[PDB]
UniProtKB/TrEMBL annotation, chain B:
Name by which UniProt lists this protein: Disks large homolog 4
Superkingdom to which the source organism belongs: Eukaryota
Subcellular location: Cell membrane; Cell projection, Dendrite; Cell projection, Dendritic spine; Cytoplasm
Coiled coil ranges: none
Family (UniProt): Belongs to the MAGUK family.
PDZ domain mapped to chain residues: 13-94
Length: 101, 102
């Protein structure tokens, strides 16, 4: 269901169409048990145009690839190779994100 | 004592000095009774350079905190907040690890 600021608490599917330089975000984590978290959304990039991804979203999977325990590089390679239409399963975890970052 | 690949079988202490991205390994487990296991050691990272941690080590404690029954998040936070010099008690359990990760 919806959390305090109208973001689903549960995992949610977000579709990104790739742009000239990528998907328009950056990630941290993938080490010491920290998952893959969105840390940056490029202004005017695909993720920002979509408007659904947020800083503090954990990327749980992309196009059938589980990233819950992936390394940072494994996640970066999976995003690079996911195709022109990328289906991301994300979960909004701003408190957990803040504890790590 | 030493096991078949020259790793102690018993719980052992490992002291890790943190680097720029962390301690240089990742963990799985911490659910449904599975403990916290090292799943990945970053090439050239602190854990790798120390030579003292291996994939299939179970992390039993961090800085005096028992993680045998800790959640994945609790273990990850404990590692994040353990400072620049981290004291880990680990036990090498490659066969048990494979039974959970298969």
């Amino acid at each position: 269901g919806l959390g305090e600021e109208d973001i689903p608490r549960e995992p949610r599917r977000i579709v990104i169409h790739r742009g000239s330089t990528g998907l328009g975000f950056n990630i941290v984590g993938g080490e010491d048990g920290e998952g893959i978290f969105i840390s940056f959304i490029l202004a005017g990039g695909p993720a920002d145009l979509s408007g659904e991804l947020r800083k503090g979203d954990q990327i749980l999977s992309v196009n059938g690839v589980d990233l819950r325990n992936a390394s940072h590089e494994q996640a970066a390679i999976a995003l690079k190779n996911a195709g022109q239409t990328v289906t991301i399963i994300a979960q909004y975890k701003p408190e957990e994100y803040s504890r790590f970052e």
